[PDB]
Amino acid sequence: KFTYPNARRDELVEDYHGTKVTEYYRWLEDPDSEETKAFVEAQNELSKPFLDACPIREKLSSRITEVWDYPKYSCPGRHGEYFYYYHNTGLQNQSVLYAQKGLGADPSVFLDPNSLSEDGTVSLRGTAFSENDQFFAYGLSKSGSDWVTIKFKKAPSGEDLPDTLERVKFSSMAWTHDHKGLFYNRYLEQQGKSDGTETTMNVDQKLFYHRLGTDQSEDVLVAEFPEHPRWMIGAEVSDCGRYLVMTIHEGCDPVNRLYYVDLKSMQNEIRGVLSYVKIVDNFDAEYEYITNDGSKFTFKTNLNASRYKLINIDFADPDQSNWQTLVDEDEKSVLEWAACVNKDKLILCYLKDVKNELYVHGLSSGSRMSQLPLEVGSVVGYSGKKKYDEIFYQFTSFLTPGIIYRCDMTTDTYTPKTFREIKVKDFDTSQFETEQVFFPSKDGTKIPMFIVHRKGLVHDGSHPVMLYGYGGFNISITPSFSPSRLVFLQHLGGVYAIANIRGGGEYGESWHKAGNCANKQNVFDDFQSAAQYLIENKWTSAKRITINGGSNGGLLVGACINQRPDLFGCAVAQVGVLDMLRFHKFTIGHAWTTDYGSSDSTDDFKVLIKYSPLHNIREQKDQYPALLLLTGDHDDRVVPLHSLKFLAQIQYTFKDSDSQTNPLMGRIDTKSGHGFGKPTAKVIEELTDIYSFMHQTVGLKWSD
Ligand SMILES: O=C([C@@H]1C[C@@H](O)CN1C(=O)CCCOc1ccccc1/C=C/c1ccccc1)N1CCSC1
């Protein structure tokens, strides 16, 4: 009983290694044409009234806003005599950066992104203080685009400098210790627009050096690899200022080349392409800089260590036969990151069965000294420099918005103190609980899953479930706080489940590789098995399951609705990759071939064609679940044509179906992108639309 927008079908046949593949909506890849704009408008004119017709939408939006309305803080970061921290009074579109002269002083606004946009669509993206804390560089992004403009302020005064760096994307921000400028990345000029609405591929990223007090036209090109247009040049200046550490990436795997420049031995100031020394000249493993003491550099690596470890490489004797293990790989836990504090101490953060743990190690020996106690959850913030004597860290969990701890590092015992508690106002979290289960996938592998629910729940199959997954790119889905999840559990009888399917990083690089490239189908099998587990154990029934994922998790949703429409009642795919044959042709999509392969390869095509959601829509005996696609017109990470073409093809497939009664809809936002930096107002509206769609499609019941 739904009438879907018209969408012209333009037969386009292409040959993939002998296999003919036909598509009909390639015209939707042009975001600027009147035809595409009319399609977008028509889809919004269908979905918006449907979402706005939810009879509980006002209560739902009000409750999400009320739960969300609590003051928020980042860890305080020391920079000289001042601490800097982000603050949100509760519902501001963007958090404000405050400065205070000591932890006990009156704070003052240092940088307010809300003052830069009337709707909060300008966000920070990357920040870096100079080594003397007298200058502050920061990136600004508009309308959610990955494109960045780097600007500069005096610190702590916050006075603006004129320096403005354009065409920045995926950028380093590394000050030299002479305080004269910084290294950053940018792309040379390109055909067409560069505002986040274009689909143009980004290649040949350059490393530049900008001198404070000059126009960007004077910036020096310091590194480029034109014979490797997909290489991306990470730049960091060593803790002593002497070395530029160059970490070169190609694609999204946790591996990099490792080169360096001796800046103090240069016979001239930074003037042109720098002469570097190669330490690691391959992509076999990760080398992530932690710290250095003179020429001895400490790196996190996965070299022969899928769960990660720390090694020492001395630049004075850099052959691999001289490298030394500093911290052994753990038998079971993934080392997520390490930081050096108070000259010779290390904070190591591990993931053990999808929960974070913190330990203090000595830098000289690598030996473990202490554990910093935590509840079950995630460490989402950290501050603590080698030159300072205390750390702060922020903890979050499903029922805990935040706890900030402070720990003095000057003695041989470590007794963290609670610095701040961030709680929802007037909400009894003790009515709810989280369980961790391990369910068998098709091949026998046990997969972790968190289930958040009201205490006293009985397993009668009656509860609506929100089942979330991602499954890729070495990303672990660890506990975190969601205000809308609380509203779902409190007022909509909901059960929230997160399946830690393969492709993520939860158990290290073997977990990641078990869910990428030719093994990508394992991810979808794992997620389908999660739904089967919830049904079999009578948490829910298929008709009451909503699946949700974003980005690579939107691919997860698209593949799962094609493969097992019978397992789900509703599906919400945000900013999803859905044309798996062409993803690599747009913006930064070429970087994802390390998880997906590429249709340019015969072997990879045989894998991709089996699951590419755009190419696998088929009516089954069971109807497809209700579907809501969400994207933004400035999502230049995953270009919105993915959602647009999938929507056109799915609506066409079921145009004349008697059995398809669930709606298949899309909402295309304006002035927003992939998600980072999206203003609070848009986030709350999106969450309201998501749960409104579920209410209207799987029969949720609101209880006051
Ligand atoms: O978004 C994604 C994936 C998932 C996750 O891997 C990130 N990612 C990207 O594509 C990020 C774009 C490539 O960036 C890099 C490439 C190589 C090495 C480093 C970087 C990032 C440095 C940087 C970035 C920003 C600021 C400063 C520095 N997907 C969408 C659909 S599935 C994949």
From TrEMBL:
<dbReference type="InterPro" id="IPR002470">
    <property type="entry name" value="Peptidase_S9A"/>
</dbReference>
<feature type="domain" description="Peptidase S9A N-terminal">
    <location>
        <begin position="5"/>
        <end position="419"/>
    </location>
</feature>
<dbReference type="InterPro" id="IPR029058">
    <property type="entry name" value="AB_hydrolase_fold"/>
</dbReference>
<feature type="domain" description="Peptidase S9 prolyl oligopeptidase catalytic">
    <location>
        <begin position="479"/>
        <end position="699"/>
    </location>
</feature>
<dbReference type="Pfam" id="PF02897">
    <property type="entry name" value="Peptidase_S9_N"/>
</dbReference>
<comment type="similarity">
    <text>Belongs to the peptidase S9A family.</text>
</comment>
<keyword id="KW-0378">Hydrolase</keyword>
<protein>
    <recommendedName>
        <fullName>Prolyl endopeptidase</fullName>
        <ecNumber>3.4.21.-</ecNumber>
    </recommendedName>
</protein>
<keyword id="KW-0720">Serine protease</keyword>
<dbReference type="GO" id="GO:0005829">
    <property type="term" value="C:cytosol"/>
</dbReference>
<keyword id="KW-0007">Acetylation</keyword>
<keyword id="KW-0645">Protease</keyword>
<dbReference type="InterPro" id="IPR002471">
    <property type="entry name" value="Pept_S9_AS"/>
</dbReference>
<dbReference type="InterPro" id="IPR051167">
    <property type="entry name" value="Prolyl_oligopep/macrocyclase"/>
</dbReference>
<dbReference type="Pfam" id="PF00326">
    <property type="entry name" value="Peptidase_S9"/>
</dbReference>
<dbReference type="GO" id="GO:0006508">
    <property type="term" value="P:proteolysis"/>
</dbReference>
<dbReference type="InterPro" id="IPR001375">
    <property type="entry name" value="Peptidase_S9_cat"/>
</dbReference>
<dbReference type="GO" id="GO:0004252">
    <property type="term" value="F:serine-type endopeptidase activity"/>
</dbReference>
<dbReference type="GO" id="GO:0070012">
    <property type="term" value="F:oligopeptidase activity"/>
</dbReference>
<dbReference type="InterPro" id="IPR023302">
    <property type="entry name" value="Pept_S9A_N"/>
</dbReference>
<keyword id="KW-0963">Cytoplasm</keyword>
